[PDB]
């Protein structure tokens, strides 16, 4: 009976190119169609685009805090986000916020930091790292390894288990995290759980199959990545270092990185990047998975205009089950 | 100073983003490969079946609860087969499973490490469906009895445990075809309700061309001739293939929109990986909401072949399943 109407008219029917999600597509159509083009804005500028725009989104419940931390003759502002009905001691992650080195902060950042603590349960130690070009490298770099080292030893005193720790960043916040990581491995600690590349910046190169296809339109331009690079160090041997181009390591500098995600955006320049240092890390014994949610652009997990999106909600969900699972 | 060791040459750089399977999945394939016997294609049924039975076997299973029931339907029983976490009393949601293997292989044992580690992650109950086989049977046997298993539950299943009105669809590859099949149905039929598909490296198309299909066409386990061999137990019939309930990639917007809130997983080095992702892309011009994952480095079936469940990305992958599971289940 079933099988005649299954078999019959009523379920009859009359290349994998990248595009948007609609959702995506809606947000890329008002910003195309608007106006001056970052690279050439001051930083004062540039930094109030991303500033206004992520400003009086719905936050998640989560629990806020702050503390400055001493160390090396260097005050570091931390802010820490809990979830919302934590007790006892909890597991950590340090989250190095993106914005090409330029743009950014905690506020511009809470949303997705509140959703990645809600999906995994662990405290955020967010750093307010110095932003380019008032710093240069290696300045929020070292920021970035003394804060994760004081989160390491001295953790109890923010309600944390400084020895169940991870690493979490969104683009240039990626770029930090492998930065840590490797700081941490030539100096011999401190240990580290996990490390979460959102759509991380890996190379001081422009010529990517990714770039190109991607150059103009999406968001994030070609020409934004190297005014970022720019700001952040035009120095040529800077530029090789693996703590600013993390892809240019060998395999043997790769030996003993933690355990890594990586997610990257389909249509996004940094996206080849993102993929071939996961690439390196498996071929150098480190354990990897590398994820490219389709549809989507750079910083897509990050824009408030997009925390709705399908594709946000369920890949920032699945970033923090990744995460526990590593913390415990 | 500590500035001056970052600047300095202990971090100088001592050293195409081409699709390659990570360290992990090429010893596999190296292992696979190294046999000496003949391709699937020209096996029997019962050879092949004993082809995944026996990678299958012997694999250390994760801590859970496995039950058995027999449903009558429209006079023909159904075996499913039910798994819960370990520790479980109480009502769960449910989701329906689907397993894989081309309509000719597989069954509940191939499947259980995976069933099981996607009732763990999720924390909700699994019911597999004990489907017809082909040749045995030919489309649409298989999706009728996975169509009326899902009404079952969602209709019956405090029987077994279960919140029938919290219910997922979860299968792989032909498994993931059988998500949107039932899907499909239960949309001209109105109802049951479905809370979330996942549809893990699926087929979606009785089409052989795609890029993905060329470029992995052979080597990567899943070859393009097993495809058209499965495909041609399933059904030969063309116009079968141009059903949307076994071509889902074949529907219009117009028969697409409505579908439920779909996570599409596929594999880098699958031959199905183009029509996966395609099928996304539609989904969501339709309106539903999907999310489309691929995981790179991965063969089709990353998430089943027990040799590979130590895999980091394996385990990362459907703890990621069963994450988004969880939460559209609720």
């Known amino acids: 009976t079933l099988t005649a109407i299954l078999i019959s008219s009523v379920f009859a029917s009359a290349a994998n190119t990248p595009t948007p999600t609609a959702g995506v597509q809606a947000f890329l159509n008002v910003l195309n169609s608007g106006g001056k083009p970052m690279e050439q804005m001051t930083p004062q500028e540039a930094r109030q685009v991303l500033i206004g725009a992520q ?3 719905k936050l998640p419940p ?3 805090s702050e503390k400055t ?19 006892g001691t909890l597991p950590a992650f340090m989250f190095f916020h993106g914005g090409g080195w330029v743009l950014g902060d905690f506020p511009t950042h809470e949303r997705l930091i509140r ?6 349960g662990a405290a955020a130690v967010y750093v307010d790292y110095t932003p380019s070009p008032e710093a240069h490298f290696p300045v929020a770099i070292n920021q970035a390894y003394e804060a994760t080292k004081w989160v390491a030893e001295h953790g109890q ?3 944390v288990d400084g020895s169940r720790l991870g690493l979490v960043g969104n683009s240039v916040g990626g770029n930090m995290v492998a930065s840590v990581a ?7 600690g401190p240990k580290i759980r996990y490390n979460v590349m959102l759509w991380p910046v890996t190379d001081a190169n422009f010529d990517t199959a990714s770039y190109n296809q991607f150059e103009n339109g999406y968001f994030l331009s070609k020409n934004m990545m190297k005014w970022f690079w720019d700001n952040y160090t035009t120095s040529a041997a800077d530029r090789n270092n693996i703590l600013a181009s993390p892809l240019r390591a060998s395999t043997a500098q790769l030996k003993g990185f933690p355990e890594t995600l990586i997610q990257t955006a389909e249509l996004d320049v940094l996206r ?9 890390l498996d071929a150098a014994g480190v354990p990897v998975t590398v994820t490219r949610y389709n ?3 750079h910083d897509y997990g990050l824009l408030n205009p997009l925390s709705q999106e399908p594709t946000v909600k369920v890949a920032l969900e699945q970033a923090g089950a990744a995460l526990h699972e590593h913390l415990k």
């Open 295 to 297: 549809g989507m652009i």
């Open 62 to 64: 989560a629990q806020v």
């Open 115 to 120: 959703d990645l603590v809600r999906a995994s």
């Open 55 to 57: 400003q009086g989104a």
């Open 272 to 280: 080849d990047e993102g993929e071939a240092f996961g690439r390196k």
């Open 69 to 87: 931390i001493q160390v090396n003759g260097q005050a570091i502002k931390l802010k820490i986000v809990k979830p919302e009905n934590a007790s």
């Open 157 to 159: 005193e923010i309600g």
């Open 182 to 188: 490797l700081q941490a491995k030539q100096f011999n």
